[PDB]
C-alpha cells in the first residue's frame, strides 16, 4: 500500500534519530530528536503526515508509543497504528563535512533518496507510487 | 518549473517560521526555527532538498542569505538561488489552542493546508510524476 510507513529509531553519538521509511519505495524521512519520548515521536509523526498521505505507520511498539500524546496526534491525523545500517553508513561518509550530527543526517537523507543506478531513485519511486494511486 | 520553490519568512508569537512553497502546486513545507540566521536557513533548505527534487529556490535575498553557510549548503545540494503567509497564519489561529507549543500548531496547519480538498499534496506528486515520465 502507498500509505504505509515504518518508523524506527537509531542511535549515534549519544543522540536519537527517528527514521520513517515509505515501505513501497524505500524513501526515508529522518531527524535527530532530543529524546525518544512520546511527545517528540508525536511531533515527528504529525510532521510526516502533513507532507505525505500517511494511512498506517508500523512502529516498534515501545515505550514512546504507550502514552497519550502519540495516540492523540495519530487520531487527529488519521493514522492507524538494513536501513538503519545503511543510513549510518552514509552518515559516516559525510560526518566530517558538518559540525552537527543533525546536518550529517540530512545530508544522508538527501543521498539516500536521490541516489540512482540509471534505475530510479527512492524519491522518484515514492512520487510514481502515490501518483499512480491518485 | 517542477523544481521551483519560494522560500519566505513569517512571524508569530515572537518566533520565526520559514515557509517553502512549491510554486506549481501550492504545497508547503514550514517550520519554526530559533532565529532567522544563515545557519538555520541552510539547514531548512538542506532538509527540503532531501525530500523533493529542488532545482531553484527563490528567496527574499535578505540578511540570512548573504553568508557562507547558505551558499555552501545550496552548492552541495545543487540548488540554484503574502496570501500564503496570511493563509497559514489564519489556519494556525484556528488550531492554536489545541497545542501547547506553536511548533505543533504550525505542523497542524501544514497538514490542513496540504490535505484540504485535488489537494496541494496530490498536485505536487502529480506534477513531479509527470515530469519524471
Amino acid at each position: 500500500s502507498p500509505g504505509i510507513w515504518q518508523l524506527d529509531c537509531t542511535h549515534l553519538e549519544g543522540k536519537v534519530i527517528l527514521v520513517a521509511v515509505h515501505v513501497a519505495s524505500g524513501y526515508i524521512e529522518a531527524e535527530v530528536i532530543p529524546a525518544e519520548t512520546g511527545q517528540e515521536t508525536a511531533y515527528f509523526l504529525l510532521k510526516l503526515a502533513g507532507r505525505w498521505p500517511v494511512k498506517t505507520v508500523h512502529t516498534d511498539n515501545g515505550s514512546n508509543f504507550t502514552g497519550a500524546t502519540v495516540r492523540a496526534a495519530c487520531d487527529w491525523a488519521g493514522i492507524k497504528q538494513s536501513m538503519n545500517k545503511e543510513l549510518k553508513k552514509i552518515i559516516g561518509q559525510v560526518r566530517d563535512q558538518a559540525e552537527h550530527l543533525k546536518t550529517a543526517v540530512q545530508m544522508a537523507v538527501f543521498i539516500h533518496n536521490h541516489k540512482r543506478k540509471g534505475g530510479y531513485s527512492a524519491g522518484e519511486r515514492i512520487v510514481d507510487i502515490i501518483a499512480t494511486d491518485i | 518549473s517542477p523544481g521551483i520553490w519560494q522560500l519566505d519568512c513569517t512571524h508569530l508569537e515572537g518566533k520565526v517560521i520559514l515557509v517553502a512553497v512549491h510554486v506549481a502546486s501550492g504545497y508547503i513545507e514550514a517550520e519554526v526555527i530559533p532565529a532567522e540566521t544563515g545557519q538555520e536557513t541552510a539547514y531548512f533548505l538542506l532538509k527540503l532538498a532531501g525530500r523533493w527534487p529542488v532545482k531553484t529556490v527563490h528567496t527574499d535575498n535578505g540578511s540570512n542569505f548573504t553568508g557562507a553557510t547558505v551558499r555552501a549548503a545550496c552548492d552541495w545540494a545543487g540548488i540554484k538561488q503574502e496570501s500564503m503567509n496570511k493563509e497559514l497564519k489564519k489556519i494556525i489561529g484556528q488550531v492554536r489552542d489545541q497545542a501547547e507549543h506553536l511548533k505543533t500548531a504550525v505542523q497542524m496547519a501544514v497538514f490542513i493546508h496540504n490535505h484540504k480538498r485535488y489537494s496541494a499534496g496530490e498536485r505536487i506528486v502529480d506534477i513531479i510524476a509527470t515530469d519524471i515520465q
Binding site: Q39, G67, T69, A72, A73 | E100
Partner: peptide, 6 residues
C-alpha cells in the same frame, strides 16, 4: 488533551 501534551 493537546496534540503535544495529552
Amino acid at each position: 488533551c493537546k496534540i503535544d501534551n495529552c
